[PDB]
Amino acid sequence: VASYDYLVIGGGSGGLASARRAAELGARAAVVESHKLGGTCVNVGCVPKKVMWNTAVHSEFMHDHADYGFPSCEGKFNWRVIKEKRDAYVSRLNAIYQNNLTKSHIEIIRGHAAFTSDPKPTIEVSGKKYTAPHILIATGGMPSTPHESQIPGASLGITSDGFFQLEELPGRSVIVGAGYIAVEMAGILSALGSKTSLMIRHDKVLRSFDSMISTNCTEELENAGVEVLKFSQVKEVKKTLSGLEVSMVTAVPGRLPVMTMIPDVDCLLWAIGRVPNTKDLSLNKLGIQTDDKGHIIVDEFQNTNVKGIYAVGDVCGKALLTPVAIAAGRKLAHRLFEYKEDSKLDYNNIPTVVFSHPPIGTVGLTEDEAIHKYGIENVKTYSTSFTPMYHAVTKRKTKCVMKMVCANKEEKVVGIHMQGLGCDEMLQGFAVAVKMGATKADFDNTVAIHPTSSEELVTLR
Amino acid sequence: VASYDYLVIGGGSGGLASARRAAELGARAAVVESHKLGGTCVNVGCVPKKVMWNTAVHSEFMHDHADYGFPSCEGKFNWRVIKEKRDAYVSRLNAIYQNNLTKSHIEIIRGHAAFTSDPKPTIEVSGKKYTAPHILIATGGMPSTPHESQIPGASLGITSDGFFQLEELPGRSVIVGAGYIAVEMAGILSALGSKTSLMIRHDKVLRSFDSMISTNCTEELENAGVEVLKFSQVKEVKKTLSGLEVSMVTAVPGRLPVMTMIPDVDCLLWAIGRVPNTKDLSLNKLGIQTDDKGHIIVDEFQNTNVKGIYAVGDVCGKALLTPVAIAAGRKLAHRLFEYKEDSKLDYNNIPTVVFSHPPIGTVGLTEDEAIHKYGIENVKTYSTSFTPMYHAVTKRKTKCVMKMVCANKEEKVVGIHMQGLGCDEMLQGFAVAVKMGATKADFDNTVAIHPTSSEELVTLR
Ligand SMILES: Cc1cc2nc3c(=O)[nH]c(=O)nc-3n(C[C@H](O)[C@H](O)[C@H](O)COP(=O)(O)OP(=O)(O)OC[C@H]3O[C@@H](n4cnc5c(N)ncnc54)[C@H](O)[C@@H]3O)c2cc1C
Ligand SMILES: Cc1cc2nc3c(=O)[nH]c(=O)nc-3n(C[C@H](O)[C@H](O)[C@H](O)COP(=O)(O)OP(=O)(O)OC[C@H]3O[C@@H](n4cnc5c(N)ncnc54)[C@H](O)[C@@H]3O)c2cc1C
Ligand SMILES: Cn1c2cccc(=O)c-2nc2ccccc21
């Protein structure tokens, strides 16, 4: 049995970051990866998604050419052109992350790892065993699909995984789900010319976000040509001559349930959740604790219930973001290999961007969350809504909405929420300020940058 | 003589903001304006500049259409189309600012004000006199042009003022100056198809900015097709058959001076400085103090040397930005009309964006400024340079450069400097953090937003 200081299962965001930082501290480390380095984000996540978003963004701005004094464009978007370049870029990234490991002198173990029943924590890959005083589980998750038993034909639909295998633009797309991935997918497919529907269980998307964002994002989706099918879910999917037929039930409150057949669907995309990647880890061989969804349970230091075994990232089911897996991974490395006992990730005030159109930026508590935590008497929100001067000369419009959530007498900024042009690049700095415990006076004492959208956040009244 | 609590000379950024805030505090206020409300920013500054920048940005991104799988565009940009819409937008803004005053119950006095010799501070407009215990001078400035005596034919050139009167795209443009206005003008004219030169006295533009920015911006200008004429200045301008001939002298260090004639120039644009608007104020009638350039001298509370007379904004020659005039104006209002004796503008850590291509964002001290202030032993800078993943699929490239300047053991962030896509909307939040006295750990403790350019500022090493 080959022994290391650090065995890391999964060469994705969390695994790579943690192994690399451990190695910097002197650890003899190995990374196990059954597929491609970079994991979900690089291969079927953040990176390819962003490239597709950028493409969609081009399509959106192109509508404004004539308004800006430019001749109109020629017609045909070509999905295949961007797909090939996206693929190549992902390949470049894979090669880069492989090299990062090697130059870090981190061993790369190719294959699927599973734990053994061996007393001291030990894994097996392709018949070979490996052990370490410290084993990180960073296996991530994967897209959820409905069982055939619940929804006959569901397997005819694809997921975000399949999305990145698409070779052509689907003529007609139905996206099922109301979370950020669903929204991003629908927004991209629609902007690029797919006749797109987004099917949601209630009245708005992003219901976990601040209500202003939930409302605005749903509206902007509709304004952009995305058909939002409210209080609707899939009952069955059937293969037809032209593509797929989606039978859905719509049950709007105050109305009667009605079943509708959606014909001629080229692409049915399930975006209804992620399942952790733990099924084949043989976690039970060591009594490693999971929840009923298969998420690995950890304390605030990413410890599992078993000594010498840790978990970070999507596999733990909390804040499923690349930078979060990375930060928890690095904090863990510092704790184990720099003996910083207090080293852990603070899961409060993690910023998120949703790449809708326009993009969404959020950090901290929703207004409701603040209300519950501080008391309605101790929360004061400031908000504004405007049309960015970018649109001063266009017939097409998007809105910018901003909300600042303040708590207590000092008006501590405990939440910032926004959607609008530039909001994707706008958030990071404000997240630093919020992390620092900025009050509203801190914002107001900061001189504005004009003319930008961002200045509106430091001149709210 | 009509008496008020507050007489404000100039209905621009600083004047409007100060009068409006005074009025909120109950002041009986009047604003004198000889031309259009909104002053320089609305009429011949920030707003129209930004619209033109947005137009130029379209042109830049259009080069990337085919790379993103879109058909190429048709050819002819039409300046006249955007000019008309820009003009209309400026007209809407004028009407808005007029209305803001009226709804604030601020009297609008149309005409040119000048002080009288009357003992108690009094102004005259169109033969009528007005007085107040508090008179704000907020007259702004105007573009500098060389005297014919120094440069024969200089009056054949225009300034940024003339820029916004242009009805067509000049075929050939020469911009003289190295500051942000020069850079923005050249960048816009060039992006829109003008054969553009930018003539600078030394080797780089923006020499007052951090050296990284000065260097990068000069390079990006060249990469974008702007001819940067280094160590060059105009000796004479002559009207020719086709347009203008610009005779310039170039004196590169280590070389001999050489005179070059630039023929067929349609647009020669002077952007070599701003002169304060004080010449016809009859400041001498009250002994109001100015410098040799005509700037009104003030203390930290915007007091002139004369009791009951104040000045804010470009007329004082310090930090010539709209948000600065606004903030100094409002702080002044609070001091005078809410009796907040400590109310004043902090002129440190004012953020600036330069709308080059890509945009520049800066706040705090350059590296050299930090070095001088803290000692080279007490300054640590972090920097990075990358190509934004937006360009992962394009043949055209721009860079993103970021520098964080840290001082002392705590590594207080005393400067942030950057150029790159999205940097215009990125800066504001970081400016709030820097104002708060953020250290590098504050940045590093902030979870990244991925994939963005902005995340690079919280993961510098
Ligand atoms: C469509 C989509 C878009 C997204 N966009 C963003 C975004 O814009 N910004 C953002 O912050 N996040 C985004 N995410 C989230 C993101 O990608 C994840 O949060 C991230 O990948 C989690 O890191 P991880 O290390 O936990 O898991 P992963 O990055 O998925 O890596 C886990 C790895 O372990 C391997 N593996 C699993 N089991 C084993 C085993 N038994 N043996 C050996 N190897 C194994 C896998 O093959 C894989 O490479 C997106 C996700 C999706 C699906
Ligand atoms: C081309 C250009 C682009 C710019 N872009 C930006 C930018 O993107 N961001 C930014 O923060 N700043 C920008 N600026 C700077 C900006 O516009 C000024 O800093 C701002 O206008 C200053 O405010 P002010 O109140 O001091 O002067 P002004 O806004 O110029 O207002 C002064 C006013 O007083 C009036 N006036 C003058 N004398 C008298 C008198 N004797 N009697 C009656 N009325 C009088 C004038 O007609 C005028 O309306 C730009 C400037 C230029 C020239
Ligand atoms: C931010 N931005 C873009 C981002 C990505 C792709 C574009 O094509 C684009 N075009 C633009 C046009 C005008 C103003 C901004 C713009």
Side-chain angles (χ1 to χ4, degrees), chain B residues 219-331:
Chain B
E219 288 174 355
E220 287 286 42
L221 278 163
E222 288 164 348
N223 294 338
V226 175
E227 185 188 41
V228 177
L229 301 166
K230 301 165 182 187
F231 297 98
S232 301
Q233 60 196 69
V234 179
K235 170 187 181 299
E236 183 171 23
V237 185
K238 283 187 254 194
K239 199 174 178 56
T240 59
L241 261 15
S242 46
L244 302 175
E245 174 195 76
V246 184
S247 59
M248 84 171 166
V249 175
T250 302
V252 175
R255 298 193 199 162
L256 289 175
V258 48
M259 183 161 303
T260 306
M261 252 54 47
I262 312 171
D264 307 320
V265 176
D266 300 298
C267 179
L268 172 67
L269 194 158
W270 299 108
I272 61 174
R274 309 270 305 169
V275 56
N277 215 330
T278 59
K279 155 178 170 286
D280 296 295
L281 273 176
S282 296
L283 297 179
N284 59 2
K285 287 193 191 317
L286 288 167
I288 293 157
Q289 180 178 349
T290 57
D291 65 14
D292 62 354
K293 288 307 180 178
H295 293 116
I296 295 164
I297 308 304
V298 296
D299 64 15
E300 60 189 341
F301 299 92
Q302 318 289 159
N303 295 311
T304 67
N305 63 318
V306 174
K307 305 297 178 57
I309 311 191
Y310 321 90
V312 310
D314 285 11
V315 79
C316 300
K318 178 164 192 163
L320 309 196
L321 295 168
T322 268
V324 172
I326 290 169
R330 291 174 172 157
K331 284 289 177 171

Side-chain angles (χ1 to χ4, degrees), chain A residues 21 24 41 46-47 49-51 54-55 58-59 61-62 64-78 81-82 85-86 89 92 192 322-324 327 330-331 345 350-353 355 389-390 392-393 422 424-433 435-438 442-443 445-455 458-459 461, chain B residues 21 24 41 46-47 49-51 54-55 58-59 61-62 64-78 81-82 85-86 89 92 192 322-324 327 330-331 345 350-353 355 389-390 392-393 422 424-433 435-438 442-443 445-455 458-459 461:
Chain A
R21 185 55 55 83
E24 268 180 38
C41 188
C46 334
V47 176
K49 177 277 299 293
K50 185 71 184 294
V51 175
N54 282 333
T55 310
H58 263 282
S59 187
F61 279 116
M62 276 171 172
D64 304 337
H65 281 344
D67 288 343
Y68 266 93
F70 293 93
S72 283
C73 282
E74 286 187 14
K76 284 300 182 189
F77 168 69
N78 192 346
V81 165
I82 193 58
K85 298 182 180 173
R86 198 188 70 218
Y89 177 41
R92 297 200 293 283
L192 295 180
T322 268
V324 173
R330 290 173 172 158
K331 284 290 177 171
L345 179 64
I350 292 164
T352 324
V353 165
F355 291 95
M389 73 160 279
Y390 167 81
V393 299
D424 58 323
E425 292 293 356
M426 192 187 305
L427 182 59
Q428 189 76 81
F430 289 105
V432 179
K435 197 68 187 285
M436 291 179 58
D442 287 319
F443 278 56
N445 288 332
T446 305
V447 167
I449 307 162
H450 182 70
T452 65
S453 288
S454 65
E455 60 175 317
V458 299
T459 58
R461 294 193 76 196
Chain B
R21 185 55 55 83
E24 268 180 38
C41 187
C46 336
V47 177
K49 178 276 299 294
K50 185 71 182 296
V51 175
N54 283 334
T55 309
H58 264 282
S59 186
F61 279 116
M62 276 171 172
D64 304 338
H65 281 345
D67 288 343
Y68 266 93
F70 293 94
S72 283
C73 282
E74 286 187 14
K76 284 299 182 188
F77 167 69
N78 191 347
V81 165
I82 193 57
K85 296 182 183 174
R86 199 189 68 218
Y89 177 41
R92 297 199 293 284
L192 296 180
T322 268
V324 172
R330 291 174 172 157
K331 284 289 177 171
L345 179 64
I350 293 165
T352 324
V353 165
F355 290 95
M389 73 160 278
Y390 167 82
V393 299
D424 58 324
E425 292 294 356
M426 193 186 304
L427 181 59
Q428 189 76 81
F430 289 104
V432 179
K435 196 69 187 285
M436 292 179 58
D442 286 320
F443 278 56
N445 289 332
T446 304
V447 168
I449 307 162
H450 182 70
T452 65
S453 290
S454 65
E455 60 176 316
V458 299
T459 57
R461 294 193 76 196

